[PDB]
Design a protein around this ligand. Structure first.
Ligand SMILES: Nc1no[n+]([O-])c1C(=O)NCCc1c[nH]cn1
Ligand SMILES: Nc1no[n+]([O-])c1C(=O)NCCc1c[nH]cn1
Ligand SMILES: Nc1no[n+]([O-])c1C(=O)NCCc1c[nH]cn1
Ligand SMILES: Nc1no[n+]([O-])c1C(=O)NCCc1c[nH]cn1
Ligand SMILES: Nc1no[n+]([O-])c1C(=O)NCCc1c[nH]cn1
Ligand SMILES: Nc1no[n+]([O-])c1C(=O)NCCc1c[nH]cn1
Ligand SMILES: [Zn+2]
Ligand SMILES: [Zn+2]
Ligand SMILES: [Zn+2]
Ligand SMILES: [Zn+2]
Ligand SMILES: [Zn+2]
Ligand SMILES: [Zn+2]
Lengths: 323, 323, 323, 323, 323, 323
């Protein structure tokens, strides 16, 4: 076989040190994200709606304005759903695509479909507009540090379409945009010209964000193939706490508790899991109280904890990429 | 699509108030149930046995003697099992079947098959004769309040046959009566003449009872699509406690702890789950100590906690139906 | 097992004799059928269309006007299709349903869906309005002889809905009304109270008619489990020829040639085949020239050969039922 | 739905007339094809071999030298086989890809893998190097007539890789390059921006060539969804015969006999069939005598009948495209 | 891979010559077989019956009395059927099992189960007691010639149990003894110690006999992977005819007509086919007139054609083994 | 059905008493095991490697030197994997195989395959060489007590091959040696001559050991069909603690906590679970810190806790067998 597609089982982080942490924390503006990155996404955006187009556009526009050589690829495809065949459009933003190994961050940008009620619309603030914004802010706050990319490894952002079901959650009505990109990736030579290494083999770890934005989340540690990376999150959250770099945060209310989760949760990682991609599944258990109700809006987001998680994740990424 | 089959995502309860609670509690006789409803069911009743006929008869007889317009329907069908094709008979008791939306309570009335041992027979007192009786007592205690039904919503009772395996638990040997009614329902126009709304779309929530009757149960909160309804149970159990309306009950031993359950349990809800029916799964974890042994009899039932749960469930129902 | 559900492997016909043949032939009016039974069905009648309702009504109305105790049952159900869940309605007309054994005749009354072209509509005259009419005329011509039913065996007519695909022929888009009645039957005790005999076990033979009405058909002999019954058709066609009871008919152009067919054809019999129901599949090979074009209309039907087949089938039925 | 993806059920040919036939026949050089198009392909070319690269290159080179705006696309992908994951490369040559409707010709360019025997190699002259060449010659002979394309319909050539099994014929070891392009096509918006029309909907008819080059072939008529197009082939073969435009040809030995084929043959059309693409399957029954032996070489090809079929197919194409 | 498991694609026969044919024909006694080999098998012998034991015993006893080093192996196993799990017992008789390559002859020795009718029992003379006897006589007539085995190739006899369905033909109720030996073989190192060659790889060709014993059979040529071997049968039948070595035989009624069979027949070869074992399927099309009726007895066998086929098959075997 | 294959639902232990415990504890030498049983297994031993042969040999050699009538059976088979078909070899050591009921202990002796890194090899000390040794020591320490076997019940050891995936964990790449022995067992008459009792029916309980050897394990209680047996382990661990028979052990750090595990873990028990075999799954949750890294070696094993578990398991076995 090829030498490099093992490089990840042994990859270790460049732990940052207090001077570094203080700057990463300095370099994220929850307020900037909240008005520049997230408020434009708090619209109805089910697949095929005009809001899917708006959101797609907004995401690329806010990436393009950055300096790093982000290579965007809209992957409009078709797939079968209750109401017939329909058009979806995953958004993929990659740095150094030539490269063999990528750390991937991901969420879904579609919003579940709901019939208007009481003249209220479902905009899906935790599920999953915040995660979209968190990934945009991360691309910004770290634009400079991420210029340094031109260890052959880099960063990819995936914003899946069609995470949600049109009707009722089932394996056949769900994960439209993930089930499709898993397969396409699984079947693409990587690097170009290989003859045994697919594009998953370059997927070092899939950090999937989902249902984030409520207060007092608890994130379980879901899979052992990635639990060492979960512990970094705990550590990163601890040190960021003892430096006074977090807001309204308590160690008695940490976000990353070493509580293991035997059971399963269906989500855009399965298509990549079952094919043995290592996964960090940053979805909370229990889900936000407002889950799948019209009350999942901006008013019920907690600024402080989106800010704390932003700071943690950005460190985790610089630490994974050695930056 | 049709307007009404969303009515349940937004349905909220008519919380009862202390004068109301005191009467619901006054209006259940654990002793009446135990001699009139449950003792006749503590017989061997595997599918096709004479005890299946006895139990079927007993259930209808005890319903018919009530005043509300309970419409009974025995749904004798056939399905394949290890030992060949066999005859099963789900029992379905419905109020206002014309109506579009139903809250459904359910258990299984078959008893697992066991070869007599030491001249002892398996009668399955927790699994699941008690749940049968709990649903009969609920129909009685609330007969009057349930006359008021002639918000288009009502109550259905399902007593599945063939929950248990004949040989060894497997997806192919199990859930005979549920796998069959799920499908039949899924394919029945509701309301009559519709052209897109099946009979599940009228299944507002499936409250499935199973393995109840032992002391000191703990019921986990299994699915988020129904966790708000689980919290009502906690609340209802709390208020009923602080009013002195419970027996031998301790808040340090509540039955409904906010302990989440990642993994899965196979049971008559799966056929209705996988098709996206919201489920409250009132089965305890851990299972009774006597589970699937000849020691699951009447002597090892705890009167007090069947009484406490009876009282809680009846409130939950009046609260769900606004009565 | 039960004794009787073998009765069919050994069932033999009461061959009719020239005086009898001459009367059956006397007793069918191709002209009556063509104006009373078939012309009302030459309308667009895809599932859910108003023409499905018209056709459904017309079929029952023309049965009800007969004397025999035809027991009609409309079996409106729901099932999943490309464009979503939809409503279908099989029509079932039975004589002596109490009885254990039935010879079943069947076709499909839906018409394939097509977008109007050149202001032309698909009415599906061979596929399958003629077979519908042929089964109505058979019920009429033999009304008297079929009064004699009150060997426990009788006659059933099935007119399936949703034979055709909405989009493109596939196992998932096809046979909506057959796949559903096969299963329901397979799971229904027969006789009522049995405990091992489904309702297929009473399905002695399924004579399925399809794509009939063109000139010069050739019907292959498809399955050995029913080839003895195919030979009766040949014989019945021969004797009816040598008696001068056929029109524009030639033995060098017989309809039932002992030409075997190795391959397979998908059609409403599969759901009943794969469950081991014996099948006579009266569909021609090759299909009419006009198959699935707007040219499959009334002008391109051949009166003479619909008349010849009508006469043959009616004999076959009286011969199978001993009448 | 969209109007145009029905355009094919009603599409009819522009029959050519004797002056036209004489020129198409004049315009094909069996000798040119045999030295310029086919002899370079009579090499071992299993997937991944150097001969796969040679053949791939040769095919594109011989297309590029033409005048029409052939748009080539090599679709290197990966898929699982007995011996592991491996790299395949379908070749796709399209004219007017912008357009909505395409008539597609196709064969496979891989050669079955065989361990050298007696110092002999399998080069697969009928299976399927000849069909490759026949499609190249067709692109040449008709280059001029095919310039006229800039009824929105055009022509596509597909040369699948991995038709053959590596080990033993099975659904899991076969059709690597077809099973993959069917799916990718099925999921691609066509035209770009559509939201219900895949790229199959533009696949008007799939004319698949395979196992051609032996003498005295007989081609059955496999599917009714395309039998009208098979009859054109018969007609085209007849008229070309009665004009003296064929060599060593006899009507008592026609190639296209109205002999129907009930059973099935597995081949690159299945992936496109099961998804309802209309298919003309030009594979003979029986297969060449030399099938899958080292004797399937150039010495055992019959020039005359490759020439006759070349002439017929080219007419069929001009007739389908109205040229 | 290993060199030898290709040896069969290129294996060719040692055609016998008139002096040889005359002796093979001299050396078979239809009368001996009919009283010594077949009459003991004309008993009810469904799986688990006492007749299965009788037949099993009879088969081994009649082999053991021979001189060649026949190594018998009864492969009693269990598998699931309608009426539950049941015990089957394939019989396997092998010469030179150490060896890598085997020509395999096979039939099934179970008889379909039928409830006695008119005090008549199903003994399955063509289906398949005759084929059993034909394989025993072949072992005898050629005992001497088959001593010569101690080209590493030899002969195996398989008599499957449970070919027939207990209830109704289906993929789940059928081929119990074949589906099981296919798998076991597929997973057994051959030769012992190999690490890639299963025991199928030593299965050079599977000659499966079934439904033989009626007059005027016609055997189609089913698969091209074995059609060269079918032609040997034609040839062998021709030469044996023109030598006056056949009885009541006519070339206008040959048994092996070059009539191809597109469709499929389910039978003990499928388990070995789908895994790419080359198959000669000696079952007639059409099936005997008496197929699956109580009339499939000894009185309706035709001595002459069992004798003619015996002679042909024995030649085919000596010709395949070079003896 | 047969009487005895229920004997296990009611089987209860012969609890040992302090004099007995002290001797079992006296009779295990962690030091002997560690040099005689385990150190020879700390080699690279993926399937087909020379180390698989070494380990296979070592296991049998160390059994054969014992006195009890251990009947060894190497079950070399073949099965499909990413890189092709490959050869595996389960090791099975049985006492009193004639007998109907067996308590089975098991682990896997293969080691996951890894490409050498930093000149380091994966030897899989917890996963699962220690469990191998623990089962050998158990056979030794109890050799004498296990002579007493000549309640028809005995002990079986299974050392599966191919537990691990070659590439990435999936249902298709995993459990090669278990998926194969489950099936073979499921289909073997037991006792020999039975006709309904497979060899699973003699599998009283499957105690599967895996990932053992690290400090401070926590073993959850996975299935209720075996939770009574898990409680024995707790009890046995408690009493062994309060007798001073354990080392470096704390009740605040017990190994068997009554912590239930809702979710699932894939492992050699599934093939036997899904077929309803009762399972005690002694794998810890969480997995060792060194899981699937080169750091899972001998240096990071904790002598004390392997010793404590050895002592506990040996008691559990004598207690299950009444010795
Ligand atoms: N349980 C569920 N019942 O319904 N759903 O959807 C469920 C679910 O688990 N969804 C996955 C998590 C999620 C939802 N939205 C975003 N992520
Ligand atoms: N685990 C199991 N192993 O076996 N079974 O049955 C199991 C099981 O989970 N059954 C479902 C719960 C139940 C049993 N009786 C009523 N409800
Ligand atoms: N081939 C086909 N390709 O498309 N279809 O539908 C096909 C087909 O075989 N249909 C079954 C026969 C039939 C059609 N209409 C009524 N009976
Ligand atoms: N039967 C077969 N047994 O093996 N195979 O491959 C078979 C087969 O049918 N292959 C499909 C036709 C073909 C072969 N080469 C090109 N086209
Ligand atoms: N068609 C059938 N319908 O029912 N069956 O069994 C059928 C069948 O094809 N059986 C296979 C051939 C056979 C039967 N007996 C021995 N060989
Ligand atoms: N999760 C996993 N992700 O990858 N694997 O293998 C996983 C796993 O669960 N393996 C089963 C436990 C095991 C491993 N080695 C021995 N037992
Ligand atoms: Zn959501
Ligand atoms: Zn139970
Ligand atoms: Zn049609
Ligand atoms: Zn080929
Ligand atoms: Zn048979
Ligand atoms: Zn492992």
């Amino acid at each position: 076989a090829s030498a490099w597609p093992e490089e990840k089982n042994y990859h270790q982080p460049a732990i940052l040190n207090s001077s570094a942490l203080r700057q990463i924390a300095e370099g994220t503006s929850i307020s900037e994200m909240w008005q520049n990155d997230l408020q434009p996404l708090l619209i109805e955006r089910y697949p095929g709606s005009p809001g899917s187009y708006a959101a797609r556009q907004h995401i690329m526009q806010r990436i393009q304005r950055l300096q790093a050589d982000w290579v965007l690829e809209i992957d409009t495809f078709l797939s079968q759903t209750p109401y017939g065949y329909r058009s979806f459009s995953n958004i993929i933003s990659t740095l150094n695509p030539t490269a063999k190994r990528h750390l991937v961050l991901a969420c879904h940008y579609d919003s579940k479909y709901f019939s208007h009620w009481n003249n209220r619309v479902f905009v899906g603030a935790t599920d999953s507009a915040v995660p979209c914004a968190m990934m945009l802010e991360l691309a910004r706050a770290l634009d400079k540090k991420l210029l340094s990319l031109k260890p052959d490894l880099s960063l990819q952002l995936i914003f899946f379409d069609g995470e949600e079901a049109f009707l009722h959650w089932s394996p056949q009505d769900s994960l439209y945009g993930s089930r499709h990109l898993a397969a396409k990736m699984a079947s693409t030579p990587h690097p170009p010209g290989a003859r045994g290494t697919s594009q998953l083999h370059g997927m070092d770890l899939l950090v999937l964000l989902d249902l984030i934005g409520a207060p007092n989340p608890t994130f379980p540690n879901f899979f052992p193939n990635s639990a060492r990376w979960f512990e970094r999150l705990q550590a990163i959250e601890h040190e960021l706490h003892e430096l006074g770099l977090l807001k309204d945060h308590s160690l008695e209310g940490r976000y990353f508790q070493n509580y293991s989760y035997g059971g399963v949760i269906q989500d855009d990682h399965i298509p990549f899991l079952r094919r043995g991609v290592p996964v960090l599944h940053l979805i909370p258990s229990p889900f936000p109280e407002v889950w799948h109700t019209m009350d999942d809006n901006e008013e019920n987001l907690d600024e402080s904890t989106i800010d704390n998680l932003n700071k943690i994740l950005q460190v985790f990424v610089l630490e994974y990429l050695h930056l």
